[PDB]
Design a protein around this nucleic acid. Sequence first.
RNA 1: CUACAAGUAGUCAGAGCCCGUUAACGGGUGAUGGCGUGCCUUUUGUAGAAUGAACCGGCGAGUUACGAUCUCGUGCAAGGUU
RNA 2: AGUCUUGGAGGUAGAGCACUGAUUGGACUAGGGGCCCGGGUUACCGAAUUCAGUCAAACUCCGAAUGCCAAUGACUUAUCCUUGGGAGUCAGACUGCGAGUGAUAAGAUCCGUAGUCGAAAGGGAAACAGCCCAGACCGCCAGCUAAGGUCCCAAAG
RNA 3: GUAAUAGCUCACUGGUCGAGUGACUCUGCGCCGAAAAUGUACCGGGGCUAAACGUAUCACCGAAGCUGCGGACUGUUCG
RNA 4: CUGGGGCGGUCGCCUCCUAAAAGGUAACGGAGGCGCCCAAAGGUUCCCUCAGAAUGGUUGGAAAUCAUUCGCAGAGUGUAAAGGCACAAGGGAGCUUGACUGCGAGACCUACAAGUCGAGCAGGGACGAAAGUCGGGCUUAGUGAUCCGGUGGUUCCGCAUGGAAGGGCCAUCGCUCAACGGAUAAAAGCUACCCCGGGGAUAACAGGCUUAUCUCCCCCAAGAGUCCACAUCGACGGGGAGGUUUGGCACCUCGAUGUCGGCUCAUCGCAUCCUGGGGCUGUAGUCGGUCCCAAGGGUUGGGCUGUUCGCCCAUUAAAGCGGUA
RNA 5: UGGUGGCGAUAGCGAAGAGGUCACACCCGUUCCCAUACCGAACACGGAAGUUAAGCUCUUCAGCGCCGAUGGUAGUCGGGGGUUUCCCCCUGUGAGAGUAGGACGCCGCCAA
Lengths: 135, 58, 81
Amino acid sequence: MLLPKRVKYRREHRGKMRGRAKGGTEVHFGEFGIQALEASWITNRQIEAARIAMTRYMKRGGKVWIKIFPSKPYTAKPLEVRMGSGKGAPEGWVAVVKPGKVLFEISGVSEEVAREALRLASHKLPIKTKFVKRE
Amino acid sequence: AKLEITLKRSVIGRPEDQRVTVRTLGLKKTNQTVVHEDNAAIRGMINKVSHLVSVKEQ
Amino acid sequence: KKGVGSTKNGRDSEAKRLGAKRADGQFVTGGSILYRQRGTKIYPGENVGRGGDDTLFAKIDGTVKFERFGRDRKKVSVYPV
RNA sequence: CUACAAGUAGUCAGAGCCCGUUAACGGGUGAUGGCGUGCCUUUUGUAGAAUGAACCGGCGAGUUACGAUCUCGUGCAAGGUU
RNA sequence: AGUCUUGGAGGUAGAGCACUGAUUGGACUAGGGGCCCGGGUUACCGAAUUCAGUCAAACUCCGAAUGCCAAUGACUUAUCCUUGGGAGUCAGACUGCGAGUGAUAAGAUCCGUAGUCGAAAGGGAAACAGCCCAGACCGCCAGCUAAGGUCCCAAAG
RNA sequence: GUAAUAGCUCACUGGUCGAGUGACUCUGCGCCGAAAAUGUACCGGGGCUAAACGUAUCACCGAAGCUGCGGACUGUUCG
RNA sequence: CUGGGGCGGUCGCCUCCUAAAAGGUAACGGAGGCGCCCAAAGGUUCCCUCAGAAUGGUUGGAAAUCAUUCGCAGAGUGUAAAGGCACAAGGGAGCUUGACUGCGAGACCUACAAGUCGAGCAGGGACGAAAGUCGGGCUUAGUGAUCCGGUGGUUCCGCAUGGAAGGGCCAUCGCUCAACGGAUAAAAGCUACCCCGGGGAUAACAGGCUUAUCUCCCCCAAGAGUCCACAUCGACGGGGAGGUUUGGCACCUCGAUGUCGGCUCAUCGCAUCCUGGGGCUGUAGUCGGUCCCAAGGGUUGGGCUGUUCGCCCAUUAAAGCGGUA
RNA sequence: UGGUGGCGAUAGCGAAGAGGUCACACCCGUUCCCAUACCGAACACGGAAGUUAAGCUCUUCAGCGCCGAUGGUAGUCGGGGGUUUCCCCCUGUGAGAGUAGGACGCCGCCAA
């Protein structure tokens, strides 16, 4: 459950996930990676689920290199409450994702193993994905 | 040169700016032929509209 | 039903209508102001003066022109006929 | 004119039938077809399942005095008026 | 007033890391261990530095489109200013776009912007204030079209 | 498969047989995933395998738009 | 004010974001500050330039002070932030009080009230040789009307005249009047004993939109299951349906839509409780579990509680879940 | 050469070299003007024995920094469309980054 240690503002606007990514569109730390085909917010619980999934499938395998970090916080008012009276309290932390963006990489491991692990992770994630490799 | 301009389409539901460009061309009714000269200003104007208008250079 | 409150972030100052007030190539009278600001986004130039509020005014009549102090720094000036 | 037809009730088209005018592309009915959710208020918006009216008739709501001001007009004009 | 031209201010979108903050991995390493004789080894941790990489409404080395302000003339269009008399309005709605709050839920709410309704009938969307097309002096048993449509309800393949 | 074994299979190999047969990327249109309450009930209906979808072409219909003809009024310029 | 009201919180001013590249722009939107301070922290003249790092060096120490090279700026700028400033607006020294009087072309902002800038003229000065700068501070907040009184000054008036009282003009003081454009110099509560005028402009029921929540279904599958993921369960995570819950919004209804439970009357859906027909099984049989098709019919009587719900007794093939204001 | 001004560091940083009889500097001493919170470092005052080392000028370079195209892309006014927390099509516009490359200076006035 990743966390930014320190932040300026505990409360931010949400934002808009228009367009494609700026960077991180291609694997370069590792060999076999995964990228997105949509745009969405992703949570520390999602990423750690995917991470531990692939690492359990691999059991010693090489290196991973996540390519993101949930910097963004997201609020949520308490339950059964009218509107207004200030912005809701923070709940967790979020990473924002554009399409064309690489999320997880892999090295030290064969292609079939990598593809299967990333499949497993994709099923923990909400969005549509693609298997990718380095050029 | 000269050119005729006609309202292929109406202004209702269009912004004031291009509505007034039309009225400045001298157009009050649909399918209204109006003559002007092949001046760059007017050409820029009909470019600014370009979707209410049909044009016929003489 | 529940009960909540205490936003304590609910104010802001009165908007002060900064920016330029006259344009390049525009004729100007003596004493007219040109660019309200805070500090110097823009400096004065010829026949132009700064006030205690860092505001720029024309000392004479003339025409306005904005330019640059060489690099990354701007200027105004009034040039008469 | 009407007893296999649904209709804010009319309108337009229209056959048949009956008449014959303030004599003119006339009148009364109207099978049948098409279109069509009343009036007023108040509303962002009412056919409105929001309000009011059973119906008919009558009565029933922005005026008068004084003063100010504007316009128009008339008369007289650096003088007008009681 | 509109357009064309010219010149301006303005730091948004976008993009980027030069600042501030957040952040991934690697290299080296101060230093601190554990191991041997003040040293001598360790990949046991490891500062800073460095390489490469991601991110930002309250961060910018940069920076548009549009819009805004003016000048010149050109073309076109006629509404503009002042003074005075008289008002009404200050419950707005939806739609599209950009934003916020919300759960990037609401025919939600609140702002900006353009339109329509309001105050606008007509044709289509089955019906259907706000959508698409389009603006009603009146008549005509004439015609050309828009949106939308052409097997029958229902005009047209 | 056995408690272990055993046993059965398989990879793989050779033989017969005589033409295609197997992995992947992208992409169009589709299938499942798919349940609710007076009655088919998310084409308006009939019904449609073209009367659907996609591209292109020409025709036609289609409004109180526009035009034509004729009247009324207002305004501007000279009836 | 209020996403009904009440309670809470706030009420004026300044800075930033939201704000959509002029300006402006809301919300019980996000972050922070003010109700001052300096008689030098002002003016002028002249001077020079920071923070940190590495070296060396008692006490000196990681960290004073020290020389030392690196060093646009990482410091400072009275205070919050933004803008801006290193040719200084930052830091020192000398002399001084322009933190002046009368004014003010012309501009900005603006409903008004008001607020802001301002060259330049006169008088008298300060610093400087001189040019020349100085009408407070680096700019932006640091404050409030009028009436009423008070103080000082005044070639103003002073009810027959002279004076006077008193008033006027000028300067100035007195208010968290903070609910900060201030209703009074002067003011808290209950009403279920209540009343009038209005409202669906605004709440409770129901309806509607949404579906966070609720119920149900599903995906990946680690793992449990002696072995074995998928007989049955299914973690961390993910995606949907429904519109029976708690709710959110306020769209009809306040010129009246009666609101829990129960009785009678039924009716519909099926995500089926039984009955019927099947697949799989960690199904020997009997009984079962789970899943699939099936809504034809049926789906108990009592005790307690107003109760719904629920617990209990005894039965039943079974004692279904819901919708219909 | 020296002085003095103008133009966005295309002027700078950095490395390497060359020159100074004139000139500019460095440099020699405080008796006076004046000064150093310490003082002749600096500021002032006077001087010119020697030094091109430094500063200053002139050459070189493209390591740093700086400038900077074209094309393409994002974005986008406008128009239109669609399975619409977004996406797509069209006229037009059009960056940043990354390149190509440019550049270790251009222009003036005075004095010998």
